[PDB]
């Protein structure tokens, strides 16, 4: 039972600011951490795999980093199409466990 505590649930932001999201793991296990993006009325979509690498089609403005118990996702130059929910997840050992979730507001 790795417990993932996220910083905040609702955060207000403006277009053009750098924003950084953080996730804290109960144990220091691995660097194999993934972020998923979920827009309203849509299923979640995988964004980052192995914490530092990008997926095909994902824009360059998305970066991620961290290790141990601390993992930081950074969005830079926020546009309108990035309104969504983001979740820090881990895929090391069963049972799979989800974060609570963070909602972006513009």
């Amino acid at each position: 039972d790795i417990v993932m505590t996220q910083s905040h649930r609702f955060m207000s932001t403006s277009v053009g600011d750098r924003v950084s999201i953080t996730c804290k793991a109960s144990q220091s296990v691995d660097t194999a951490v993934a972020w998923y993006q979920q827009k309203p009325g849509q299923s979640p979509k995988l964004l980052i795999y192995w914490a530092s690498t990008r997926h095909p089609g994902v824009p360059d403005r998305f970066t991620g980093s961290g290790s141990g118990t601390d993992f930081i996702l950074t969005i830079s130059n926020v546009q309108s199409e990035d309104l969504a929910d983001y979740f820090c997840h881990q895929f090391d050992r069963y049972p799979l466990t989800f974060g609570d979730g963070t909602k972006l507001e513009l």
Partner: protein
């Protein structure tokens, strides 16, 4: 791959919930993981269980013995059965396929558990 969920949208409490995931574009007897995932009101996700390519099973312990997951390889379909349902189990149910840094989700279906 395309995934399409089907089944009754209303289930009476204490009765059994059955859903069908119809899979097209890929064979369930070859590779990857074939999952059921649900989303509660308030946008929270809880993983229920998975399947191996060889038909092995595994479940989230929080669901105890309430879940059996089964498949029909002739029709290329797999199935969810959920015993002893409660209205706090009302949620939108997805069947998803995950692996090899490729994650695909169905469109989902809505179910309400009420009398």
């Amino acid at each position: 791959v395309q995934l399409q969920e089907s089944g009754p949208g209303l289930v009476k409490p204490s009765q059994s919930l059955s859903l069908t995931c119809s899979v097209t574009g890929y064979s369930i007897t070859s590779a990857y993981y074939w999952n059921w995932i649900r989303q509660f009101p308030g946008k929270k996700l809880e993983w229920m269980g998975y399947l191996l390519y060889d038909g092995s099973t595994g479940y989230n312990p929080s669901l105890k013995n309430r879940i059996s997951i089964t498949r029909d390889t002739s029709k290329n379909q797999f199935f969810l059965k959920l015993n002893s349902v409660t209205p706090e189990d009302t949620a939108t149910y997805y069947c998803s396929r995950e692996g090899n840094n490729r994650s695909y989700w169905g469109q989902g279906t809505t179910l309400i558990v009420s009398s």
